[PDB]
Structure 1
């Protein structure tokens, strides 16, 4: 159905990598921490690492993917933070975490020429683009804030070692030399818990593997640690608010 191919609402997206998104083919409402940030078409979007957002997207042209996104891996992000410090010196609201800006003509050119196979060129383009943006303080702040490795990041790193394993709070506490209460209370001071972390890791991986179109749902369910393919579909639909099929159809066409 054609209205299903333009408009989708997706809940509980966790931004695990610092992300620059260009709304090439969509208008997008971002809902996080009871705020609403509408990004129109042809705007840049900077999503701080660690935000959990819900998104309502409306495509401009139905036959093409909604947006083009750049996710910085942890290395890239470190170097980019380091260079930004040297260039600008050393030194929260949802609006300090998710920011939208207009992209002019030339920026749009360098935006399209991004290599993403060449680290040095890619950091150079980002530095260039950041310098050309006004009020780029909030954006540099955002890159800084997102470069510090919190405790929930150690927990994610532990879990990412073996995403299929049947993790428990006890297992986490063993691996860290603490009691369950210590880890719970340490994760509670960052407003998460262990189940939240584990579910967001599994569901992020599952989303990404779905878009490859190279693994069967039963395969994806096993790769992320869920016993049943029919149970994974229940969980994914409960989590994201759309089914693997509908999710996939939105980003890879019908």
Structure 2
């Protein structure tokens, strides 16, 4: 009688738009809380780390519908949104708040129709539809801010881009210190000003790739483990359970 699940330590690596087709989910980012009811839209700003508690309505269907944007697209939308609207200058990368990174609204019939006939194959049509949707929302300022913030490239993003070219290699701080011509102290203090370290980034990348590949339903567990750079399958199951809080079979069964 488990139509509920708790998941820990999820990263949003792409600006994400979510629609609750059938679930109710509470979100604990750090030490706050935002709950999302049945029929709503959610805007998730790129680079937040959050934990979730979900309850489904119907078991024979999946909990939600998701739209994600890559970097080219995100930049385009930022550009055209700059042209159509104004330009703000809270450009100081200082104070954050969870309530400026997560947002929910109540979906209408007219928004729902356009949401229906969205097919993420025609790129320009997709950009048009998102701008149309944003225009119909009240207090949309908070969204445009979050779309600009997530368009700038930090040093951690360069480290990530470097790592993604060979995920099954065995990286160390010394090797990263070679590609960027600097010292280990320089690189570790640079990543320390953004409140992270090298092991954290490597772990988040590998567990993101694994969670995504599990849902394709076209590779054994050993194939996934060899793809992300891990010796044995049983070791991989231990680490997945310790990071996310559930087993790969439970994850797959819930989200199908």
Q: How high is the TM-score relative to the length of structure 1?
A: 0.95
SS where residue 2 of structure 2 aligns?
helix
Q: Which has the higher helix share?
A: 1
* Separation of aligned partners in 2, 1:244 and 1:157: 27
Q: Is the 8 Å Cα contact of residues 5 and 62 (structure 1) preserved in structure 2?
A: no
Give 2:24's aligned residue: 27
Q: Which runs of 5+ in 1 are unaligned?
A: none
Q: Is the 8 Å Cα contact of residues 209 and 220 (structure 1) preserved in structure 2?
A: yes
SS where residue 178 of structure 1 aligns?
coil
Per-residue CA deviation, residues 146-178 of structure 1 (Å, 9 max, x unaligned), is 111111100110111111111111111111111
Alpha-carbon shift at residue 192 of structure 1 (Å): 1.4
Q: Is the 8 Å Cα contact of residues 48 and 98 (structure 1) preserved in structure 2?
A: yes
Alpha-carbon shift at residue 209 of structure 1 (Å): 0.2
Per-residue CA deviation, residues 47-98 of structure 1 (Å, 9 max, x unaligned), is 1000001111111111100000111011111101111111112221001011
Q: Is the 8 Å Cα contact of residues 5 and 249 (structure 1) preserved in structure 2?
A: no
* Separation of aligned partners in 2, 1:5 and 1:19: 27
* Separation of aligned partners in 1, 2:154 and 2:173: 18
- Pairwise CA RMSD: 1.0
Q: Is the 8 Å Cα contact of residues 20 and 71 (structure 1) preserved in structure 2?
A: yes
- Which of 45, 49, 67 aligns to 1:52? It is 49
Alpha-carbon shift at residue 118 of structure 1 (Å): 1.0
* Separation of aligned partners in 2, 1:177 and 1:192: 20
Q: Is the 8 Å Cα contact of residues 46 and 98 (structure 1) preserved in structure 2?
A: yes
* Separation of aligned partners in 1, 2:87 and 2:177: 35
Comparing 170-179 and 203-212, the one that deviates more: 170-179
Alpha-carbon shift at residue 185 of structure 1 (Å): 1.4
* Separation of aligned partners in 1, 2:194 and 2:116: 37
Per-residue CA deviation, residues 194-251 of structure 1 (Å, 9 max, x unaligned), is 1111111100000000000101111111111111111111111111111111001111
Deviating above 2 A after TM superposition, structure 1's stretches of 4 or more consecutive aligned residues are none
Alpha-carbon shift at residue 40 of structure 1 (Å): 0.9
Q: Is the 8 Å Cα contact of residues 19 and 71 (structure 1) preserved in structure 2?
A: yes
* Separation of aligned partners in 2, 1:182 and 1:108: 50
Alpha-carbon shift at residue 5 of structure 1 (Å): 4.8
Q: Is the 8 Å Cα contact of residues 97 and 142 (structure 1) preserved in structure 2?
A: yes
